[PDB]
Coordinates of C-alpha atoms and ligand atoms in Angstrom, one line a residue:
Chain A
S14 CA 80.1 126.2 93.7
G15 CA 81.4 123.6 96.5
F16 CA 81.5 120.0 95.8
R17 CA 79.9 118.2 99.7
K18 CA 79.3 114.6 99.1
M19 CA 75.4 114.5 99.3
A20 CA 72.5 112.2 99.6
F21 CA 69.6 112.6 98.5
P22 CA 66.5 113.2 100.0
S23 CA 65.4 110.7 102.3
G24 CA 62.2 111.6 103.0
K25 CA 60.2 109.9 100.7
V26 CA 62.0 106.1 102.0
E27 CA 60.6 107.7 105.6
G28 CA 57.8 106.5 104.7
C29 CA 58.7 102.9 104.3
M30 CA 60.5 101.9 107.1
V31 CA 58.7 99.9 109.2
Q32 CA 60.2 97.3 112.3
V33 CA 59.8 94.1 111.5
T34 CA 60.0 91.9 115.4
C35 CA 60.7 87.3 114.8
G36 CA 61.3 85.7 118.4
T37 CA 63.8 88.0 119.1
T38 CA 65.5 89.1 116.6
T39 CA 64.0 93.0 115.8
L40 CA 65.5 94.5 112.8
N41 CA 64.2 96.8 109.6
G42 CA 61.1 96.5 107.1
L43 CA 60.7 98.5 103.4
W44 CA 56.9 98.9 102.6
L45 CA 56.5 99.2 99.5
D46 CA 52.5 98.7 98.4
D47 CA 51.4 95.9 101.0
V48 CA 55.0 94.0 101.1
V49 CA 57.0 94.5 103.2
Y50 CA 60.7 94.0 103.0
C51 CA 63.3 92.4 105.2
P52 CA 66.8 90.7 105.6
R53 CA 64.9 86.6 106.2
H54 CA 67.8 86.9 109.3
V55 CA 64.9 88.2 111.2
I56 CA 64.2 84.3 111.3
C57 CA 67.2 83.5 113.2
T58 CA 68.9 84.5 117.2
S59 CA 72.5 84.4 117.1
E60 CA 73.5 81.0 117.6
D61 CA 71.3 79.8 114.2
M62 CA 73.6 82.0 112.4
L63 CA 75.9 80.3 112.5
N64 CA 74.8 76.7 109.6
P65 CA 70.9 78.2 109.1
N66 CA 69.0 76.6 107.2
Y67 CA 66.2 79.1 105.9
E68 CA 63.9 77.0 104.8
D69 CA 63.5 74.8 107.9
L70 CA 63.1 77.5 110.5
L71 CA 61.1 78.9 108.6
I72 CA 58.2 75.9 108.7
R73 CA 58.3 77.2 111.7
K74 CA 57.0 80.4 111.6
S75 CA 53.8 81.7 110.5
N76 CA 51.9 85.4 109.4
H77 CA 51.3 85.4 113.7
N78 CA 54.7 85.5 113.9
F79 CA 55.8 88.1 112.2
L80 CA 55.2 91.4 114.4
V81 CA 55.5 94.8 111.5
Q82 CA 55.3 98.4 113.4
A83 CA 54.5 101.3 111.3
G84 CA 55.2 104.2 113.6
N85 CA 53.3 103.5 116.2
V86 CA 50.4 101.6 114.7
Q87 CA 50.4 97.5 113.8
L88 CA 50.3 96.2 110.8
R89 CA 48.3 92.8 110.2
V90 CA 51.0 89.4 107.9
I91 CA 48.5 87.7 105.7
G92 CA 51.3 85.7 104.4
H93 CA 55.1 85.8 103.9
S94 CA 56.9 84.6 101.6
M95 CA 61.1 83.6 101.1
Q96 CA 62.9 85.4 98.0
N97 CA 66.4 84.3 97.7
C98 CA 67.7 87.0 101.4
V99 CA 64.8 88.6 101.7
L100 CA 61.1 88.3 103.0
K101 CA 58.6 89.3 101.7
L102 CA 55.5 89.8 104.0
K103 CA 51.9 90.4 102.3
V104 CA 49.8 93.3 104.8
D105 CA 46.3 94.3 104.9
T106 CA 47.8 97.3 104.1
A107 CA 48.8 98.7 101.7
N108 CA 51.7 101.8 102.1
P109 CA 50.3 105.2 102.0
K110 CA 52.8 106.9 101.8
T111 CA 54.3 103.7 99.1
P112 CA 56.4 106.5 96.7
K113 CA 57.2 105.9 92.6
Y114 CA 59.3 103.0 93.0
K115 CA 62.0 100.7 91.0
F116 CA 63.8 97.2 92.3
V117 CA 67.5 98.1 90.1
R118 CA 70.6 95.7 90.7
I119 CA 73.5 98.1 90.7
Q120 CA 76.6 96.9 89.5
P121 CA 80.0 98.3 91.7
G122 CA 81.1 101.7 91.0
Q123 CA 78.0 103.0 91.5
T124 CA 76.2 105.3 94.3
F125 CA 73.7 105.5 96.7
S126 CA 72.0 107.2 99.7
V127 CA 71.8 104.6 102.9
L128 CA 68.8 105.6 105.0
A129 CA 70.4 104.7 108.0
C130 CA 67.0 103.3 111.0
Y131 CA 67.0 101.3 114.4
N132 CA 64.0 99.8 115.2
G133 CA 62.2 100.8 111.8
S134 CA 62.9 103.8 113.1
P135 CA 65.3 106.8 110.6
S136 CA 68.6 107.8 112.3
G137 CA 70.7 108.8 109.8
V138 CA 71.4 109.7 105.9
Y139 CA 75.4 109.1 104.1
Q140 CA 76.1 108.2 100.9
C141 CA 77.4 104.9 99.1
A142 CA 79.3 103.6 96.5
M143 CA 79.2 99.9 95.9
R144 CA 82.8 98.8 95.8
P145 CA 84.8 96.1 93.4
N146 CA 84.5 93.8 95.9
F147 CA 81.1 94.1 96.3
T148 CA 81.1 95.8 100.0
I149 CA 80.1 98.4 101.7
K150 CA 81.9 100.8 104.1
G151 CA 79.2 101.6 105.1
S152 CA 77.8 102.7 109.8
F153 CA 75.7 100.1 110.5
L154 CA 75.0 99.1 114.4
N155 CA 73.4 95.7 116.1
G156 CA 69.0 96.3 114.3
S157 CA 70.9 97.9 111.4
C158 CA 69.5 94.9 109.3
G159 CA 67.8 95.8 106.4
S160 CA 67.5 99.2 106.1
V161 CA 68.1 100.4 102.9
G162 CA 70.8 102.1 100.0
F163 CA 68.6 104.4 97.0
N164 CA 68.7 106.6 94.6
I165 CA 65.7 109.0 93.0
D166 CA 65.7 110.0 89.9
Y167 CA 63.3 113.1 90.5
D168 CA 59.9 111.6 91.8
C169 CA 61.1 107.5 91.4
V170 CA 63.1 105.7 94.3
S171 CA 65.2 103.7 92.6
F172 CA 66.1 100.5 95.4
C173 CA 69.2 99.0 95.2
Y174 CA 70.2 97.8 98.5
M175 CA 69.4 96.0 102.0
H176 CA 71.6 95.7 104.4
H177 CA 72.6 92.3 106.1
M178 CA 76.0 91.6 107.6
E179 CA 79.1 93.3 108.4
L180 CA 82.2 91.3 107.8
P181 CA 84.1 89.9 110.7
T182 CA 86.4 92.5 109.1
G183 CA 84.2 95.6 109.3
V184 CA 83.2 95.9 106.2
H185 CA 79.4 94.9 105.3
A186 CA 77.7 93.4 102.8
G187 CA 73.7 93.0 101.8
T188 CA 71.2 92.0 98.9
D189 CA 69.2 93.7 96.3
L190 CA 65.3 93.9 96.6
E191 CA 65.6 91.0 95.1
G192 CA 67.1 89.3 98.3
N193 CA 70.2 88.6 96.1
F194 CA 73.7 89.5 97.3
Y195 CA 75.6 92.1 96.0
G196 CA 79.2 89.5 96.0
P197 CA 79.7 86.4 97.3
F198 CA 78.5 86.6 99.9
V199 CA 76.2 84.8 102.3
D200 CA 73.5 85.3 105.3
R201 CA 75.5 83.3 107.8
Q202 CA 78.1 83.8 110.5
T203 CA 80.9 82.7 108.8
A204 CA 84.6 83.9 107.9
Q205 CA 83.7 85.7 104.3
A206 CA 86.7 88.0 103.0
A207 CA 86.5 90.3 101.2
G208 CA 89.0 90.1 98.1
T209 CA 91.0 94.0 96.9
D210 CA 89.0 97.1 97.1
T211 CA 90.0 98.2 94.5
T212 CA 90.0 102.6 93.7
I213 CA 87.0 102.9 91.5
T214 CA 89.2 105.2 89.0
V215 CA 86.0 107.0 86.4
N216 CA 84.5 107.9 89.7
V217 CA 88.5 109.8 91.2
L218 CA 88.3 111.5 87.7
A219 CA 84.2 112.9 87.6
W220 CA 85.9 114.3 91.2
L221 CA 88.6 115.3 89.7
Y222 CA 86.6 117.1 87.1
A223 CA 83.8 117.9 90.4
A224 CA 87.8 119.6 91.7
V225 CA 88.5 121.4 88.4
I226 CA 84.7 123.1 88.1
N227 CA 85.1 123.9 92.3
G228 CA 88.4 126.1 91.3
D229 CA 90.9 123.4 92.8
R230 CA 93.5 123.2 90.0
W231 CA 96.4 123.0 91.2
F232 CA 97.3 118.9 90.0
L233 CA 95.6 120.1 86.5
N234 CA 99.4 119.2 84.8
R235 CA 101.2 119.8 81.1
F236 CA 101.1 115.6 80.5
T237 CA 98.9 112.9 78.1
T238 CA 98.8 109.7 78.1
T239 CA 96.8 106.8 76.6
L240 CA 94.3 104.2 78.2
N241 CA 96.5 101.0 77.5
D242 CA 99.8 103.5 79.9
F243 CA 97.4 105.1 81.7
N244 CA 96.4 100.7 82.9
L245 CA 100.0 99.8 83.6
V246 CA 100.1 102.9 86.3
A247 CA 96.8 101.7 87.5
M248 CA 97.3 98.0 87.4
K249 CA 100.3 99.3 89.7
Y250 CA 98.0 101.1 92.0
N251 CA 95.2 98.7 92.9
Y252 CA 93.6 101.1 90.5
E253 CA 90.0 99.6 88.2
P254 CA 91.5 99.6 84.4
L255 CA 90.5 102.0 82.7
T256 CA 88.2 101.6 79.8
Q257 CA 86.6 104.1 76.3
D258 CA 83.0 102.7 77.9
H259 CA 84.5 105.3 81.0
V260 CA 85.9 107.4 78.6
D261 CA 82.9 107.7 76.4
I262 CA 80.9 109.1 80.3
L263 CA 83.1 111.5 81.7
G264 CA 82.8 113.3 78.1
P265 CA 80.1 115.7 79.1
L266 CA 81.9 116.4 81.8
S267 CA 85.6 117.2 79.6
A268 CA 83.8 119.5 77.0
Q269 CA 82.4 121.2 80.5
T270 CA 85.8 121.7 81.6
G271 CA 87.7 121.8 77.9
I272 CA 90.7 119.0 80.0
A273 CA 90.6 116.2 76.9
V274 CA 89.8 113.0 79.7
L275 CA 93.3 111.3 78.9
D276 CA 95.2 114.9 79.7
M277 CA 93.1 114.2 83.5
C278 CA 93.9 110.4 83.5
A279 CA 98.2 112.6 83.1
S280 CA 97.2 114.5 86.3
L281 CA 96.3 111.1 88.4
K282 CA 98.2 109.5 86.7
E283 CA 100.8 112.4 87.4
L284 CA 99.3 111.5 91.1
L285 CA 99.0 107.8 92.5
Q286 CA 102.9 107.9 91.6
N287 CA 103.6 111.8 93.2
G288 CA 100.5 111.7 96.0
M289 CA 99.2 114.9 96.7
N290 CA 102.2 116.2 99.0
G291 CA 100.5 117.7 102.3
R292 CA 98.2 119.9 99.8
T293 CA 94.4 119.0 99.6
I294 CA 92.0 118.9 96.5
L295 CA 88.2 119.5 98.0
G296 CA 89.2 119.0 101.2
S297 CA 90.8 115.3 101.2
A298 CA 93.9 114.8 100.9
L299 CA 93.0 111.4 99.9
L300 CA 91.2 111.0 95.5
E301 CA 87.7 110.4 96.3
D302 CA 86.2 107.2 94.3
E303 CA 82.8 107.6 95.8
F304 CA 81.6 110.4 93.2
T305 CA 80.3 108.8 89.7
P306 CA 80.2 111.4 86.7
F307 CA 76.2 110.9 86.5
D308 CA 77.3 112.4 90.9
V309 CA 79.0 115.2 89.3
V310 CA 76.9 116.2 87.0
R311 CA 73.8 116.0 88.8
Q312 CA 75.9 118.0 91.5
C313 CA 77.3 120.7 89.6
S314 CA 73.9 121.8 88.2
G315 CA 71.3 121.6 90.6
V316 CA 69.0 118.8 89.8
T317 CA 65.8 118.7 91.8
Chain B
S23 CA 81.1 99.6 113.6
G24 CA 81.7 101.7 110.7
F25 CA 81.3 105.5 110.8
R26 CA 80.1 108.1 108.6
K27 CA 79.7 111.9 107.7
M28 CA 76.0 111.3 108.1
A29 CA 73.1 113.7 108.3
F30 CA 69.8 113.7 109.8
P31 CA 66.8 112.2 107.5
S32 CA 65.6 115.2 106.1
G33 CA 60.9 114.3 105.3
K34 CA 60.3 117.1 108.1
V35 CA 62.4 119.2 106.6
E36 CA 61.3 118.9 103.2
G37 CA 58.2 118.9 103.7
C38 CA 59.2 122.9 104.3
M39 CA 60.4 123.8 101.5
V40 CA 58.3 125.7 99.4
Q41 CA 59.9 128.0 96.7
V42 CA 60.0 132.3 96.5
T43 CA 59.8 134.5 93.6
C44 CA 59.8 137.9 94.3
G45 CA 59.8 140.0 90.4
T46 CA 62.8 138.0 88.9
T47 CA 65.0 136.1 92.0
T48 CA 63.4 132.9 92.7
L49 CA 65.3 130.9 95.6
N50 CA 63.5 129.0 98.4
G51 CA 61.7 129.7 101.5
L52 CA 60.8 127.5 104.2
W53 CA 56.8 127.0 105.7
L54 CA 57.0 126.8 109.0
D55 CA 53.0 127.5 110.1
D56 CA 51.4 130.6 108.6
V57 CA 55.3 131.7 107.7
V58 CA 57.4 132.1 105.3
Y59 CA 60.6 132.8 105.9
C60 CA 63.1 133.3 103.4
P61 CA 66.4 135.5 102.1
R62 CA 65.9 138.9 102.7
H63 CA 68.1 139.2 98.9
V64 CA 65.3 137.7 97.6
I65 CA 63.6 141.7 96.2
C66 CA 67.5 142.2 95.1
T67 CA 69.0 142.0 92.0
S68 CA 72.1 140.6 91.0
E69 CA 73.1 144.8 90.6
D70 CA 71.1 145.2 93.8
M71 CA 73.9 143.3 95.5
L72 CA 75.8 145.5 95.0
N73 CA 74.6 148.6 97.5
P74 CA 71.0 147.0 98.2
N75 CA 69.5 149.6 101.0
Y76 CA 66.8 146.8 101.8
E77 CA 64.0 148.4 103.5
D78 CA 64.5 151.3 100.5
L79 CA 63.7 148.0 98.1
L80 CA 61.5 146.7 100.0
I81 CA 58.9 150.4 100.1
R82 CA 58.2 149.2 96.6
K83 CA 56.5 145.7 97.1
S84 CA 53.6 144.6 98.1
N85 CA 52.4 140.7 99.6
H86 CA 50.8 139.8 95.8
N87 CA 54.8 140.1 94.7
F88 CA 56.0 137.2 96.3
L89 CA 54.7 133.6 95.2
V90 CA 54.8 131.1 97.2
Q91 CA 55.4 127.9 96.0
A92 CA 55.0 124.6 97.8
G93 CA 54.2 121.9 95.3
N94 CA 52.1 122.8 91.9
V95 CA 50.6 125.0 94.4
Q96 CA 49.9 128.6 95.0
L97 CA 50.2 130.6 99.1
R98 CA 48.1 133.5 99.2
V99 CA 50.8 136.4 101.1
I100 CA 48.1 138.0 103.0
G101 CA 51.5 139.9 105.1
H102 CA 55.5 140.2 105.4
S103 CA 57.7 141.9 107.3
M104 CA 61.2 142.4 107.2
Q105 CA 63.1 140.9 110.3
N106 CA 67.1 141.5 110.3
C107 CA 68.3 139.8 107.1
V108 CA 64.9 137.5 107.0
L109 CA 61.4 139.2 105.2
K110 CA 59.2 136.6 107.2
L111 CA 56.1 136.0 104.4
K112 CA 52.8 135.8 106.2
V113 CA 50.4 133.3 104.8
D114 CA 46.6 132.1 104.6
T115 CA 47.7 127.6 105.7
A116 CA 49.2 126.7 108.0
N117 CA 51.2 124.0 106.5
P118 CA 49.7 121.5 107.3
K119 CA 53.5 119.1 107.6
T120 CA 55.1 121.5 109.9
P121 CA 57.2 118.8 112.9
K122 CA 57.7 120.3 116.4
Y123 CA 61.1 123.2 115.8
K124 CA 62.7 125.4 117.4
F125 CA 65.5 128.0 116.3
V126 CA 68.2 128.0 117.8
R127 CA 71.3 129.9 117.2
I128 CA 74.4 127.4 117.4
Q129 CA 78.1 128.1 117.9
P130 CA 80.8 128.0 115.5
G131 CA 82.3 123.8 115.9
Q132 CA 78.3 122.9 116.1
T133 CA 77.7 120.7 112.9
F134 CA 74.2 120.1 111.6
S135 CA 73.1 118.9 108.4
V136 CA 72.1 121.4 105.3
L137 CA 69.5 120.3 103.6
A138 CA 70.5 121.9 99.0
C139 CA 67.0 122.6 97.5
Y140 CA 66.1 124.6 93.8
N141 CA 63.2 126.4 93.4
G142 CA 61.4 124.5 95.8
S143 CA 62.9 121.0 95.4
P144 CA 65.4 119.3 97.5
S145 CA 68.0 118.4 95.5
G146 CA 70.1 117.1 98.6
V147 CA 71.2 116.2 102.0
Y148 CA 75.0 116.8 103.7
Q149 CA 76.4 117.6 107.1
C150 CA 77.9 120.9 107.8
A151 CA 80.0 122.2 110.4
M152 CA 79.5 126.3 111.3
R153 CA 83.7 127.3 111.4
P154 CA 85.6 129.0 113.3
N155 CA 85.7 132.1 111.4
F156 CA 81.4 131.5 110.7
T157 CA 81.2 130.2 107.1
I158 CA 80.1 127.1 106.1
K159 CA 82.0 125.3 103.4
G160 CA 78.8 123.7 101.6
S161 CA 77.7 122.3 98.0
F162 CA 75.4 126.0 97.0
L163 CA 74.4 126.7 93.2
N164 CA 72.6 129.5 91.9
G165 CA 69.0 129.5 92.9
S166 CA 70.0 127.7 96.8
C167 CA 69.6 130.6 98.8
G168 CA 66.8 130.1 101.6
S169 CA 68.2 125.8 101.9
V170 CA 68.3 125.8 105.9
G171 CA 70.6 123.7 107.9
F172 CA 69.0 121.6 111.1
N173 CA 68.8 119.0 113.3
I174 CA 66.5 117.6 115.0
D175 CA 66.6 115.3 118.3
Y176 CA 63.6 112.4 118.0
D177 CA 61.0 114.9 115.5
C178 CA 61.9 118.7 116.1
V179 CA 63.5 119.9 114.7
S180 CA 65.9 123.3 115.7
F181 CA 66.3 124.8 112.2
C182 CA 70.6 127.0 112.3
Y183 CA 70.9 127.5 109.4
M184 CA 69.6 129.2 105.9
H185 CA 71.8 129.8 102.9
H186 CA 72.6 133.7 102.3
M187 CA 75.7 134.3 100.2
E188 CA 78.4 133.1 98.2
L189 CA 81.3 134.8 99.7
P190 CA 84.6 135.4 96.6
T191 CA 86.7 132.8 98.1
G192 CA 84.4 130.4 97.5
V193 CA 83.0 129.0 101.0
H194 CA 79.1 129.6 102.2
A195 CA 77.4 132.4 104.8
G196 CA 74.3 132.9 106.4
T197 CA 72.1 133.5 109.1
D198 CA 69.8 131.4 111.8
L199 CA 65.5 131.5 111.4
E200 CA 66.1 135.3 113.1
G201 CA 67.9 136.3 109.8
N202 CA 71.6 137.0 112.2
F203 CA 73.9 136.1 110.4
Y204 CA 76.9 134.1 110.9
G205 CA 79.6 136.2 111.8
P206 CA 80.7 139.9 110.7
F207 CA 79.1 138.8 106.6
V208 CA 77.0 141.2 106.0
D209 CA 74.0 140.6 102.1
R210 CA 75.6 142.3 100.8
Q211 CA 78.3 141.4 96.9
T212 CA 81.8 143.2 98.3
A213 CA 84.7 142.2 99.2
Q214 CA 83.9 139.8 102.1
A215 CA 86.8 138.0 102.7
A216 CA 86.4 134.6 106.2
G217 CA 89.6 135.3 108.9
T218 CA 91.3 132.2 109.7
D219 CA 89.7 128.5 109.1
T220 CA 91.4 127.5 112.5
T221 CA 90.7 122.6 113.0
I222 CA 88.4 122.5 116.2
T223 CA 90.3 120.7 118.1
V224 CA 87.9 119.2 120.5
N225 CA 85.7 117.5 117.4
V226 CA 89.8 116.2 116.0
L227 CA 89.4 113.5 119.6
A228 CA 85.3 113.0 119.3
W229 CA 86.4 111.9 116.0
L230 CA 89.6 110.3 117.2
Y231 CA 87.6 108.4 119.9
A232 CA 85.3 107.0 116.8
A233 CA 88.7 105.5 115.1
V234 CA 89.8 103.8 118.6
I235 CA 85.7 103.2 118.5
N236 CA 85.5 101.2 115.2
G237 CA 89.2 99.5 114.6
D238 CA 91.1 102.4 113.6
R239 CA 94.1 102.2 116.0
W240 CA 97.3 102.3 114.9
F241 CA 98.5 106.7 116.8
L242 CA 97.4 105.4 119.5
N243 CA 101.0 106.1 121.5
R244 CA 102.5 106.4 124.9
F245 CA 102.4 109.3 126.1
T246 CA 100.2 111.9 127.6
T247 CA 100.4 115.8 127.1
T248 CA 99.0 118.8 130.0
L249 CA 96.1 120.4 128.8
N250 CA 98.9 123.9 127.7
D251 CA 101.5 121.5 126.3
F252 CA 98.7 121.0 123.9
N253 CA 97.5 124.5 123.5
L254 CA 101.5 124.9 122.2
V255 CA 100.7 122.5 118.9
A256 CA 97.6 122.7 118.7
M257 CA 98.5 127.5 117.8
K258 CA 100.7 126.2 115.6
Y259 CA 98.8 124.4 113.5
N260 CA 95.9 126.2 113.9
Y261 CA 93.7 124.2 115.8
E262 CA 90.8 125.7 118.0
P263 CA 92.7 125.9 121.7
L264 CA 91.1 122.8 124.3
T265 CA 89.4 124.3 127.3
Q266 CA 88.4 122.3 130.5
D267 CA 84.7 122.4 129.2
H268 CA 85.8 120.1 126.3
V269 CA 87.7 118.2 127.9
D270 CA 84.5 117.4 129.9
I271 CA 82.8 117.0 126.7
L272 CA 84.9 114.1 125.7
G273 CA 84.2 111.9 129.5
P274 CA 81.6 109.8 128.5
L275 CA 83.9 109.2 125.3
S276 CA 87.2 108.8 127.5
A277 CA 84.6 106.9 129.5
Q278 CA 83.4 104.6 127.1
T279 CA 87.8 103.9 125.7
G280 CA 89.1 103.7 128.5
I281 CA 91.5 106.1 127.1
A282 CA 91.9 110.0 128.8
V283 CA 91.5 113.2 127.2
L284 CA 94.7 113.6 127.5
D285 CA 96.1 111.2 126.4
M286 CA 94.0 110.9 123.2
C287 CA 95.4 114.4 123.2
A288 CA 98.7 113.6 123.1
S289 CA 98.9 111.6 119.8
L290 CA 96.3 114.3 118.5
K291 CA 99.4 116.4 119.1
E292 CA 102.6 113.3 117.5
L293 CA 99.9 113.1 114.6
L294 CA 100.1 117.0 114.1
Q295 CA 104.0 117.6 114.5
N296 CA 104.7 113.9 112.4
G297 CA 101.4 113.7 109.9
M298 CA 99.6 110.1 108.6
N299 CA 103.0 108.9 107.1
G300 CA 100.1 108.5 104.4
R301 CA 98.6 106.2 106.2
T302 CA 94.6 107.1 106.6
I303 CA 91.9 107.3 109.9
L304 CA 88.6 105.9 109.2
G305 CA 88.6 106.4 105.6
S306 CA 90.5 110.2 105.7
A307 CA 93.8 111.4 105.2
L308 CA 92.8 114.5 107.2
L309 CA 92.3 114.9 110.3
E310 CA 88.1 115.3 110.5
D311 CA 87.1 118.1 112.8
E312 CA 83.1 118.1 111.4
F313 CA 81.7 115.1 114.2
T314 CA 81.4 116.4 117.2
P315 CA 81.3 115.0 120.4
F316 CA 77.7 114.7 120.2
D317 CA 77.1 113.8 116.6
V318 CA 79.8 110.3 117.5
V319 CA 77.8 109.6 120.8
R320 CA 74.6 109.3 118.4
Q321 CA 76.4 106.9 116.1
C322 CA 78.3 104.5 118.3
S323 CA 74.8 103.5 119.9
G324 CA 72.3 104.1 117.2
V325 CA 69.9 107.4 118.0
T326 CA 66.9 107.1 115.9
Ligands
UHG404 C1 54.3 87.6 100.4 C2 54.1 87.9 98.7 C3 54.8 87.9 98.3 O1 55.4 86.3 98.1 O2 54.6 88.1 98.0 C4 52.9 87.1 99.5 C5 52.7 85.8 100.1 C6 51.5 84.8 99.4 C7 50.4 85.5 99.3 C8 50.8 86.6 99.1 C9 51.8 87.0 98.3 N1 49.7 86.2 97.7 C10 48.1 86.0 98.2 C11 47.8 85.0 97.4 C12 46.8 84.5 97.1 C13 46.9 82.8 98.4 CL1 46.7 81.9 98.8 C14 48.8 83.4 98.9 C15 49.4 84.2 99.1
UHG405 C1 55.2 138.4 108.3 C2 54.6 137.8 109.8 C3 55.2 138.3 110.7 O1 56.0 139.5 110.6 O2 55.4 137.5 111.4 C4 53.5 139.0 109.7 C5 53.6 140.5 108.8 C6 52.7 141.0 108.1 C7 51.2 140.8 109.7 C8 50.5 139.2 111.0 C9 52.5 139.0 110.6 N1 50.3 139.9 111.5 C10 48.9 140.3 111.5 C11 48.8 140.7 112.2 C12 47.6 142.4 112.1 C13 48.7 142.6 110.4 CL1 47.6 144.5 110.8 C14 49.8 142.5 109.6 C15 50.6 141.9 111.0

């Protein structure tokens, strides 16, 4: 028993982190097969970031200007190309530690682990969720760009995120591994305000099921609701509308606990309207939304 | 910016996890050099756990009864010995992935990362603290015994914890890598109630400094206090007494922010007496105590 905000083991991704330096800028790259992927803003100075013309800036760069270091050994760059907001540097050596991998573009509400790195060296790992406004609330200092987000299914790493920017409000923005930003963000140092950070309702419900499984049951009540009634309260509290697809995804947790999804929605409705009253659920004083239903099943069953 | 509950990258420890089976019991072992370390209760059935005589149970075990598997390859056991509550199985092959390591016995209030494993396979990584009552609040299912806790200093892994038991109240107990339990716990399935789970004051203060550094400043007030006055409030709220040693440890964070330690204690005193009033600090609605001052400095400076 016990329920923790757990990240995937990071070893398979640690084996892929490299340092990329272009001029005076150093950030992280991801080395998979004979390609190194990194944010294209490695070619910018902080001055360039105000209004960068990436195609023009890239014309002044040759393969030998991209310094790629894996541990203490230098990799030879034999080609480079820009794909959306990522640079791909072709190297002459395939990464011997390349795991089985895929590039996936995640949906808002989905979770993933981040291996925060500096100078191609891993510093820490934590579990994130793609917010409904397409930002992530991470822990990224200068030099962390190029750190990646991923999920692991047995031995295959699905890379879903690469860190690019910190918005003026301290939230983070980045791309998938094809270089397309999540949300409306751009790799320019300009006013980029995020939209409403709504709560991922289906994840809060999954976490309430984890709480019931792990013994925390005080919030269970004698009520039920309907999707439409629940959604009237969800709107008021900036929660994402719950759909029948979300109810279906929560089916296995409902079956395991014997608590109908709409009964759990009624517990959540009361928690929203009445608050916690100074109580906690799974060691939290707020309703946690960075565990998907799949995460709850995985952690509660011990998937390796 | 941003502050997350971050675990150390787990790759160096993933390379050490093996599966140990004795009879019908399977748990995890830690393979370092030519020794595999695992909980001695791998020799017990659930029936034996009620009143186990470990020395007597161990007489019926020979080297060939301990099945050690590293991935899909079997390790040959050439010796075994019991050291306190851990079994050490000497194998004929040194682990080629053995990192630089130390065994350390941590103090209550110290944090570490846990690589939760099942059948010698890593499932997830999370950050824990040794509670003042010598329990940990982890995420451990049946089969997780032998999963380890550690800290990493550049390239050296300091192993500090091995999981052994889940107390009847859902909290966890375990040993250091010499097999000595933290706290008064024993490896017997019996009534083992934990003492008061007090809050680690120095860690809450470190986390309030992290909040100030990362922009969350609403809780800063116009007051100061003394250690003795603060400790009168700490006692009332089941917080650990703050010592001059704790004040000294917070010195670097006080210097960086310009907030005197006792001024931060006065902010904490007001937070204890008045509550959060529905507000959050670093995305939390409670006062977080599983970041040490060293963790805050490390994460806020990007140590790899
Ligand atoms: C950066 C990477 C990529 O775009 O995948 C890359 C970049 C350049 C090349 C590449 C892969 N393969 C080549 C084969 C022939 C020639 Cl003339 C150039 C290239
Ligand atoms: C389990 C491990 C340990 O106690 O470290 C171990 C266990 C048994 C032996 C060992 C290390 N080295 C030996 C050298 C000679 C003989 Cl006769 C036995 C052993």
